[PDB]
């Protein structure tokens, strides 16, 4: 009848790059641009994260009264598809999750994240 079998359970991001922040920054930037470009229809929630993190990685979680979800440039941060929706209150939410994560630790996940949306199949 049939003699086949499918199975694939493994996920080990790049470590030879993770270490190097340069290659991580190059990816982080591209990842962001990719979003701004509007080529990868990432989940609103996801894209939200990136933004929230961007601000974080941008300045840092070492703020609250100054760092506002408005001051941000969702227009120069999120793609039109989002601009229209104007998901601000959403951004903040992400930050809440981030909390006070390292600027690098955030950048790392960022690349991975952007590397999570684009799946192969």
Q: What gross morphology would you assign?
A: globular
Our measurement of the CA-to-CA distance between the termini, rounded to an integer number of angstroms, reads 25 Å
> What series of H and E elements makes up the topology?
HHHHHH
Helix residue percentage: 55-70%
Q: Class, according to the CATH hierarchy?
A: Mainly Alpha
DSSP strand content: under 5%
Largest sheet: none
CATH second-level architecture: Up-down Bundle
**What integer value in Å does the Rg equal?**
16 Å
Number of strands: 0
Keyphrases for this structure?
121 residues; mainly alpha; Acyl-CoA Binding Protein; 56% helix; 0% strand; globular; structural protein; ACBP-like
Please describe what this structure looks like.
- The protein is mostly helical.
- The chain is built from six helices and no strands.
- The protein has a single domain, classed as Acyl-CoA Binding Protein.
- Helix 2 crosses helix 6 and helix 3 crosses helix 5.
- High molecular weight cytoskeletal protein concentrated at regions of cell-substratum contact and, in lymphocytes, at cell-cell contacts. Involved in connections of major cytoskeletal structures to the plasma membrane.
- This is Talin-1.
Please render the helix and strand layout as text.
Blueprint: H1 15-18, H2 21-37, H3 44-58, H4 80-85, H5 88-98, H6 103-117
């Amino acid at each position: 009848e049939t003699l086949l079998l499918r199975r694939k359970f493994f996920y080990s991001d790049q470590n030879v790059d993770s270490r190097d922040p340069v290659q991580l920054n190059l990816l982080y930037v591209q990842a962001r641009d990719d979003i701004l470009n509007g080529s990868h229809p990432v989940s609103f929630d996801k894209a939200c994260e990136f933004a929230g993190y961007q601000c974080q990685i941008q300045f840092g979680p070492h703020n609250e009264q100054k760092h506002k979800p408005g001051f941000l440039e969702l227009k120069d941060f999120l793609p039109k598809e989002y601009i229209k929706q104007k998901g601000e209150r959403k951004i903040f939410m992400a930050h809440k999750n981030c909390g006070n994560m390292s600027e690098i630790e955030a950048k790392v996940r960022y690349v991975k994240l952007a590397r999570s949306l684009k799946t192969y199949g």
